[PDB]
Amino acid sequence: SSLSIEARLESIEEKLSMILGLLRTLNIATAGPTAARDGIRDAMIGIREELI
Amino acid sequence: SIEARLESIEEKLSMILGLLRTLNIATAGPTAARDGIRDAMIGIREELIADIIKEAKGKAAEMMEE
Amino acid sequence: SLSIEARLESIEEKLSMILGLLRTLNIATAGPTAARDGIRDAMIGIREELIADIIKEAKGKAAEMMEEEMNQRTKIGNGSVKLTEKAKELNKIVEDES
Amino acid sequence: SLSIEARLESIEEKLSMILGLLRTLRDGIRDAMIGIREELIADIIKEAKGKAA
Amino acid sequence: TVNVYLPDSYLKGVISFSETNAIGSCLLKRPYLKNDNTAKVAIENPVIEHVRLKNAVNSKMKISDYKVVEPVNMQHEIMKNVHSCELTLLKQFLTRSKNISTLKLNMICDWLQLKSTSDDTSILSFIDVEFIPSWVSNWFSNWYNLNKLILEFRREEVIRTGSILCRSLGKLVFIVSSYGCIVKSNKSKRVSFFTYNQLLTWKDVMLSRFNANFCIWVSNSLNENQEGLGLRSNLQGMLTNKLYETVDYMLSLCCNEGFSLVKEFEGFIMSEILRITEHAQFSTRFRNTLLNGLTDQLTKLKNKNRLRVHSTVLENNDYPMYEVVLKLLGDTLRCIKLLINKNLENAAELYYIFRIFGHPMVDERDAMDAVKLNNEITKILRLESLTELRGAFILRIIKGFVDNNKRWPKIKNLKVLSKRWTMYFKAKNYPSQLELSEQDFLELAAIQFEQEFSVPEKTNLEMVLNDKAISPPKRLIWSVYPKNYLPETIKNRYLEETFNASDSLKTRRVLEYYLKDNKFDQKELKSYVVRQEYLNDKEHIVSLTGKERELSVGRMFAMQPGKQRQIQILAEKLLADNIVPFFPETLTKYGDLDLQRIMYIARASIVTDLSKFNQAFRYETTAICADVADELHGTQSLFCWLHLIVPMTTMICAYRHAPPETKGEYDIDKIEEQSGLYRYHMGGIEGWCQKLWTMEAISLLDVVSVKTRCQMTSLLNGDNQSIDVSKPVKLSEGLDEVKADYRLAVKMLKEIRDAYRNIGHKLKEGETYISRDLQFISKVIQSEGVMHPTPIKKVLRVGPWINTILDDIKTSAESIGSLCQELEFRGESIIVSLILRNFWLYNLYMHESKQHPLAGKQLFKQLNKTLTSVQRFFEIKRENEVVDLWMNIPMQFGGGDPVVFYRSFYRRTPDFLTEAISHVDILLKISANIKNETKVSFFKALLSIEKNERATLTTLMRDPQAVGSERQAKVTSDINRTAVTSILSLSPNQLFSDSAIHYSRNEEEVGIIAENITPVYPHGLRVLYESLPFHKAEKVVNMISGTKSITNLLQRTSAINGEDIDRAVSMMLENLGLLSRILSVVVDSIEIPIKSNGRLICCQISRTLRETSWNNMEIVGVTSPSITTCMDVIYATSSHLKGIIIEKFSTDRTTRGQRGPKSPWVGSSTQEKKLVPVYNRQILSKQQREQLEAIGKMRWVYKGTPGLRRLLNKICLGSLGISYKCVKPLLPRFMSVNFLHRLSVSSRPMEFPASVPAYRTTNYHFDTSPINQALSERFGNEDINLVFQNAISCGISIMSVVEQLTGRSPKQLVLIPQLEEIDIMPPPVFQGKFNYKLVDKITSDQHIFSPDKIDMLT
């Protein structure tokens, strides 16, 4: 019966980390400035050259 | 209800986890893809991985071709 | 004694509040900027405010399109849609003298 | 009494950050620039072990 | 050396607008029907064609002295003029058809054991030819004259590449040209300019008119003297002629909007059907819903016209004032109500009126500008419902995987799920729909799947190669518009641009695009889609041709460049293979869903239209599920492309004539937004993501079903969504059913409308409506279980030269037979079908074959040569009956009769040859005009062969039921095989040249592989054909053959060549005279397999004929004892010597108009008892699954045979890349020793439906048990050739033709086999070693069409 007490809480923490990871991207394109819209594109282009 | 009071915490936050995934997908469309941030906003989908793998290991096999 | 359990029931209302936001949260979709230049990115907004912004930024017939399609709607109760007075001529003519 | 009163602390300290960034509806481009690469290579590991095993 | 610009004989296209505006503007020197740029350009730089027309009409009577009315206005002159009476010719054709049909009915009645009192009106004198009511003649003389004119035009235009034909016709002098035409009325002093489209559409109109009034005249003339012989319909010919004239007058008065107002006719008719079949609570609702919209369109009309006519030559004309148009609507709905005298078979048959009146003059840029306002709107959404959609989509996927695979679709992160969905993950099951309310979908929407599926690496050429127009690229676009319509700057920049790009990017045809390519690399799409090189595609454009369909003023067909269209086709294919299943509603529709299965719990239905649905979608609406599908399929963005790339680019509406109002700038992204362009199209194109939009239109019904607690189902027949709702009320004893169903329906309607409003669609009132039962499942009017037909929709356009790429009598007659037979399959009155068949076959053979545009009198000299041959053979005294004897003969024996005697009782069959043999046998037996010892010599003539020729087996592989030794009638596919291989060979595509030079070598090497086998199972050879890559290549060749211009693929001519002309002429010349070819010798030295019952056993003649055209290679399996000759009928009641018995459940004289207790009779072959693989089927493409099935079928058909294992190993090695012992577990293990009966495969039917509908089939119950004592005493317990599904379906067709002929249906009838005709098929023992090596080279050179090579999956 050790799934109701601590498993629910570490699962909540994992779900919350994923919630925050989404909320950190939700405000780049339309909430963020159009000048910083273009920031991540150079990472998306460099990743082709960054991996062995 | 010491353990039934947080199952509704986990479920009610999974609900907003889903609403946030949906809102990300709706906020990553023609406007991100016009510039090149849609791919980061969504994530890598296990084929660009294979493309970079094949190109990198072709350039790594081509070292022995001199 | 007090900060061992009440934190759960507090964050409960905290995230229920979050849901209160989300559920009613509205998304206007991408469009021109009304200058015929640029796809205006989506608007994450509350319905009323987004209707007002869009209404004031739109021009010409489009404004009537949005006012009829969104602010108006198909008000229907208990069916039996009234035959308009002008079509009542076509209906008396059709179902009579036959 | 080793983790049940430790995890809730981090939880409650993250919730306020979450609603703080949600109330907006500079430093994040970096966050996602690392967030993507964190799984890109963890999944390249398995995509290559499928070439290996 | 010699090109041809042969026009078409029927519409086969669309009526344009800008071509008519330019043809007006040129001659008037003033804008005609508009003032747009088209007018300016035409009047300024007029093109050669319209300048030659200007010169001709200037030499002819003056324009300036006539009132130039638009073409629509002259319908009431054209359909009311009179040309010298051709009723003598109508009567001649009708008498010949009557004689032929008397022969056919005698043939039927002979073996049906019918007879009469020697009355001259046996069946076929109710139609007193002298008493034609003259409402059909008024359309027939008009149509004969107009068709003669058009044939003269065709004949003179095959000769001259451009000609102006001026022809008088009563008071309407026409002038015709391939590109323009003019009509002048000397009675009314009015000219109308229009084009071939709108010239031959009044011809299709009058033809459909004639064959729709004639088909009901014959029906009522046979129903006034025998109730049941005719179609069940009572339509007044005079009243419907009044309807036609009235609506033609209203269409004349309203210039180009009476068509958009006639679109309401379908709604009216549906409302009348509802008034008949329901109570007021729905009929008055639909009626008041459509009447308001009709009245609104009617008021708006005037304003529309006066907007369109500004600055034109019709502002000095006037538009009909409201009350007269309302009186005309009143008269025509009075007519549509009097014709429908409370009858749901009259109302069903009436549907032809939509297409009757004629297609509208679709305007090119006005539909596009109308839908601009709908495409450009911002639409507020609700994130909750938006994610509930995703949850429902995920749920359908999960139910699909649980059902098919028994495992959970792999997920990236198993922490986005609650404990509920985690234990369900470990359970592998799916919560029943009483559960999964909102929150469950909301948290189901949080899942991210991994790559469970896989994209095929190689481009499937069978898929990409399909003849469709391809829009040019962005920079090279102006080539679609004439060189005179453009400025000099744009002209020069185009001329210099065209040399930077390769010859591929100039074509507007897919086949040319993929043949003339130099650098084509089958692996490209796997790079393109992944690297996302289309998200900003600057050489990207979207041309909206405005090709459309009946009775509406817009349907804009897209055209996209090749790079893009490979992506559209790829997405559609991948969906149809993987994601379309998991969804019963949408793939099951056409053939299973509606017919057999769909047929206080408050029950109700909705019929909501989804035709103008594609324009309401945004990315934020569609990507929600598109990304789920894309995560399963494994790439970043593949299904949302329509919303990612489109908004940047520009709509052109690139019709041949209409230009844009250019200013002298070449980039289209620069041009200011015109009426014909607009850049930002935020929405969705028509037909590009239809499957995914139907998937989200279905997935929202689940959301609504969980919000409510009803049981919803959906059926999507084509363009609409029809929903069925079932909800227990648990509140009764007051208002019993109708107010309950009504309130349920209204509540459901409001809920669905709210669900759609939360997404962005403004569902209208006049599109969606309500009813208790769904009455519109696939546009067939079912009521209370009886399916009321729509018989005359297909027989409207059965005139001569139908459905032909080139004018071929064989294919034309076959199309006539196939259309008209719907009046036997969907419709009753087989007598009507025989009459309306023979009438037109006569008009094709003996009156129209003379003036053939290509060969002239050659056809008629040939037909009169095989007519004299047959006469001298059968010793006929009168030539009036030798055409009858030649026209009651199948096509495969050079006689024109494309209704084989089996087609009239059971649709599908083995051994067409033997069925035709029995047909001609019974014909010659009943024909008591010839002398005996010639009806028996005909078969010796058939059997006297010149067999000592090549024993080529690819013929059998392509058509297992074929005869050879020049007996088979050559088709376009074989005759053009060597020409298309010759042309393919010289093609800058290295791959295609390399496969085509090798084509004839593989074709001559395949036969070898199973030459030295005994017995040759041709279906086994068909399996060996499908297992190899050669099949796809042969299919590609067959597809590029039937194009109407075969040897001008690599040349921009759009013209037919003299070589193809002569080839088609020689085909139709050496195919008709086949009867003389088989009647030229007669050998007497064959003991014929005669019987001692009075008839010939056709199976012992067909077997010997096949073996003798085959070299006595002992083909085992292909033949079936025909039901027509062996299984005789006798009518009786529950007392006989144990024959297969058919009994009726009712005691009504007729057996129509009812559904009985039973569930219908469709005959399932009971094929392929399958111990299916239980390994993953997902990661293998449909191509690979098909291949595996074929290899397993080889493993089953050939067992214990030498070399088979090595053959399969090489086949695998070449096709799939793997060996056969490492794919053995993946194959299907069949277990049976009767593969002959079992192995239903292509070119072998798996179903055996009768020639009656389901409601007629639901009133007969059959027993076949009594025949097993005969069968088991004469033959052993081993299997028998006869197919009892076919036998019983033919007995039910016997009961139908018998009830129809005589209005007293038998209470019971028993069918008896005569076992001298029926043989047995013991499972054979294959004795012979394959040739196997050759497969290696065959797959070395047909590898481009091979599936993708599996590297490591097992």
Coordinates of N, CA and C in Angstrom, one line a residue, chain E residues 624-704:
Chain E
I624 N -4.1 20.0 -33.9 CA -4.2 19.3 -32.6 C -4.2 17.8 -32.8
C625 N -4.9 17.3 -33.8 CA -4.9 15.8 -34.1 C -3.8 15.5 -35.2
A626 N -3.5 16.5 -36.1 CA -2.5 16.2 -37.1 C -1.1 15.9 -36.4
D627 N -0.8 16.6 -35.3 CA 0.4 16.3 -34.6 C 0.4 15.0 -33.9
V628 N -0.7 14.5 -33.5 CA -0.8 13.1 -32.9 C -0.5 12.1 -34.0
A629 N -1.2 12.3 -35.2 CA -0.9 11.4 -36.3 C 0.5 11.5 -36.7
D630 N 1.1 12.7 -36.7 CA 2.5 12.9 -37.1 C 3.5 12.3 -36.1
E631 N 3.1 12.3 -34.8 CA 4.0 11.6 -33.8 C 4.0 10.1 -34.0
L632 N 2.8 9.6 -34.3 CA 2.7 8.1 -34.6 C 3.5 7.8 -35.8
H633 N 3.4 8.6 -36.9 CA 4.0 8.4 -38.2 C 5.5 8.7 -38.1
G634 N 6.0 9.5 -37.2 CA 7.4 9.7 -37.0 C 8.1 10.8 -37.7
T635 N 7.5 11.9 -38.0 CA 8.3 13.1 -38.4 C 7.8 14.4 -37.8
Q636 N 8.5 15.4 -37.9 CA 8.2 16.7 -37.3 C 6.9 17.3 -37.7
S637 N 6.7 17.6 -39.0 CA 5.5 18.1 -39.6 C 5.3 17.4 -41.0
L638 N 4.3 16.6 -41.0 CA 3.9 16.1 -42.3 C 2.4 16.2 -42.6
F639 N 1.5 16.2 -41.6 CA 0.1 16.4 -41.9 C -0.5 17.8 -41.8
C640 N 0.2 18.7 -41.2 CA -0.2 20.1 -41.1 C 0.3 21.0 -42.3
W641 N 0.9 20.4 -43.3 CA 1.5 21.1 -44.4 C 0.5 22.1 -45.0
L642 N -0.7 21.7 -45.1 CA -1.7 22.5 -45.8 C -1.9 23.9 -45.1
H643 N -1.8 23.9 -43.8 CA -1.8 25.2 -43.0 C -0.4 25.8 -42.8
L644 N 0.7 25.1 -43.0 CA 2.0 25.7 -42.8 C 2.4 26.4 -44.1
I645 N 2.3 25.9 -45.3 CA 2.9 26.5 -46.5 C 1.9 27.4 -47.2
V646 N 0.6 27.1 -47.1 CA -0.4 27.8 -48.0 C -0.5 29.3 -47.7
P647 N -0.5 29.8 -46.4 CA -0.8 31.2 -46.1 C 0.2 32.1 -46.7
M648 N 1.4 31.7 -46.9 CA 2.4 32.6 -47.6 C 2.1 32.8 -49.0
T649 N 1.7 31.8 -49.7 CA 1.6 31.8 -51.2 C 0.4 32.5 -51.7
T650 N 0.2 32.5 -53.0 CA -0.8 33.3 -53.6 C -1.7 32.4 -54.5
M651 N -3.0 32.6 -54.3 CA -4.0 32.0 -55.2 C -4.1 32.8 -56.5
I652 N -4.2 32.0 -57.6 CA -4.1 32.6 -58.9 C -5.4 32.5 -59.6
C653 N -6.1 31.4 -59.5 CA -7.3 31.1 -60.4 C -6.8 31.1 -61.9
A654 N -5.9 30.3 -62.2 CA -5.2 30.3 -63.5 C -6.0 29.4 -64.5
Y655 N -7.1 30.0 -65.0 CA -7.8 29.5 -66.1 C -7.1 30.0 -67.4
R656 N -7.3 29.3 -68.5 CA -6.6 29.5 -69.8 C -6.7 31.0 -70.2
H657 N -7.8 31.6 -70.0 CA -8.1 33.0 -70.5 C -7.8 34.1 -69.4
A658 N -8.5 34.0 -68.3 CA -8.5 35.0 -67.3 C -7.1 35.4 -66.8
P659 N -6.5 36.5 -67.1 CA -5.3 36.9 -66.5 C -5.5 37.7 -65.2
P660 N -4.4 38.0 -64.4 CA -4.5 39.0 -63.4 C -4.2 40.4 -63.9
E661 N -4.7 41.4 -63.3 CA -4.4 42.8 -63.7 C -3.0 43.2 -63.3
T662 N -2.1 42.6 -64.0 CA -0.7 42.9 -63.8 C -0.3 44.4 -64.1
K663 N 0.7 44.9 -63.5 CA 1.2 46.2 -63.7 C 2.5 46.3 -64.4
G664 N 3.2 45.1 -64.5 CA 4.5 45.0 -65.1 C 5.6 44.5 -64.1
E665 N 5.1 43.8 -63.1 CA 6.0 43.2 -62.1 C 5.8 41.6 -62.2
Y666 N 6.9 40.9 -62.1 CA 6.9 39.5 -62.3 C 6.6 38.6 -61.1
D667 N 7.0 39.1 -59.9 CA 6.8 38.3 -58.7 C 5.3 38.5 -58.3
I668 N 4.6 37.3 -58.1 CA 3.2 37.4 -57.7 C 3.0 37.9 -56.3
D669 N 4.0 37.7 -55.4 CA 3.9 38.2 -54.1 C 3.9 39.7 -54.0
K670 N 4.2 40.4 -55.1 CA 4.3 41.8 -55.1 C 2.9 42.4 -55.5
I671 N 2.2 41.8 -56.4 CA 0.9 42.3 -56.9 C 0.0 42.6 -55.8
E672 N -0.6 43.8 -55.9 CA -1.7 44.2 -54.9 C -2.9 43.2 -55.1
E673 N -3.5 43.0 -54.0 CA -4.6 41.9 -53.9 C -5.7 42.3 -54.9
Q674 N -5.9 41.5 -55.9 CA -6.9 41.7 -56.9 C -8.2 40.9 -56.6
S675 N -9.1 40.9 -57.5 CA -10.3 40.1 -57.5 C -9.9 38.6 -57.7
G676 N -8.9 38.3 -58.5 CA -8.5 37.0 -58.8 C -7.3 36.5 -58.1
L677 N -6.6 37.3 -57.2 CA -5.6 36.9 -56.3 C -5.9 37.3 -54.9
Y678 N -5.3 36.5 -54.0 CA -5.2 37.0 -52.6 C -4.2 36.1 -51.9
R679 N -3.3 36.7 -51.2 CA -2.1 35.9 -50.7 C -2.5 35.1 -49.4
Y680 N -3.0 35.8 -48.4 CA -3.2 35.2 -47.1 C -4.5 34.4 -47.1
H681 N -4.3 33.1 -47.4 CA -5.4 32.1 -47.3 C -5.2 31.3 -46.0
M682 N -5.7 31.8 -44.9 CA -5.6 31.2 -43.6 C -6.3 29.8 -43.4
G683 N -7.0 29.4 -44.4 CA -7.9 28.2 -44.2 C -7.4 27.0 -44.9
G684 N -8.4 26.2 -45.3 CA -8.1 24.8 -45.9 C -8.7 24.7 -47.3
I685 N -7.9 24.0 -48.2 CA -8.3 23.8 -49.5 C -9.2 22.6 -49.6
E686 N -9.9 22.4 -50.7 CA -11.0 21.4 -50.8 C -10.4 20.0 -51.3
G687 N -10.5 19.0 -50.5 CA -10.0 17.7 -50.8 C -8.5 17.4 -50.5
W688 N -7.8 18.3 -49.8 CA -6.4 18.1 -49.5 C -6.2 17.4 -48.2
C689 N -7.0 17.7 -47.2 CA -7.0 17.0 -45.9 C -8.3 16.5 -45.5
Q690 N -9.0 15.9 -46.4 CA -10.4 15.5 -46.2 C -10.5 14.4 -45.2
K691 N -9.6 13.4 -45.2 CA -9.7 12.3 -44.3 C -9.5 12.8 -42.9
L692 N -8.5 13.7 -42.7 CA -8.2 14.2 -41.3 C -9.4 15.1 -40.8
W693 N -10.0 15.8 -41.7 CA -11.1 16.6 -41.3 C -12.4 15.8 -41.0
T694 N -12.5 14.7 -41.7 CA -13.6 13.8 -41.3 C -13.3 13.1 -40.0
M695 N -12.0 12.9 -39.7 CA -11.6 12.3 -38.5 C -11.8 13.2 -37.3
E696 N -11.7 14.5 -37.5 CA -12.0 15.4 -36.3 C -13.5 15.7 -36.3
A697 N -14.2 15.5 -37.4 CA -15.7 15.7 -37.4 C -16.3 14.5 -36.8
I698 N -15.7 13.3 -36.8 CA -16.2 12.2 -36.1 C -15.7 12.2 -34.6
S699 N -14.5 12.6 -34.4 CA -13.9 12.6 -33.0 C -14.7 13.7 -32.1
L700 N -15.4 14.6 -32.7 CA -16.1 15.5 -31.8 C -17.4 14.9 -31.4
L701 N -18.0 14.0 -32.2 CA -19.2 13.3 -31.7 C -19.0 12.5 -30.4
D702 N -17.7 12.0 -30.2 CA -17.4 11.3 -28.9 C -17.5 12.3 -27.8
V703 N -16.9 13.5 -28.0 CA -16.9 14.6 -27.0 C -18.4 14.9 -26.6
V704 N -19.2 15.0 -27.6 CA -20.6 15.3 -27.3 C -21.3 14.2 -26.6

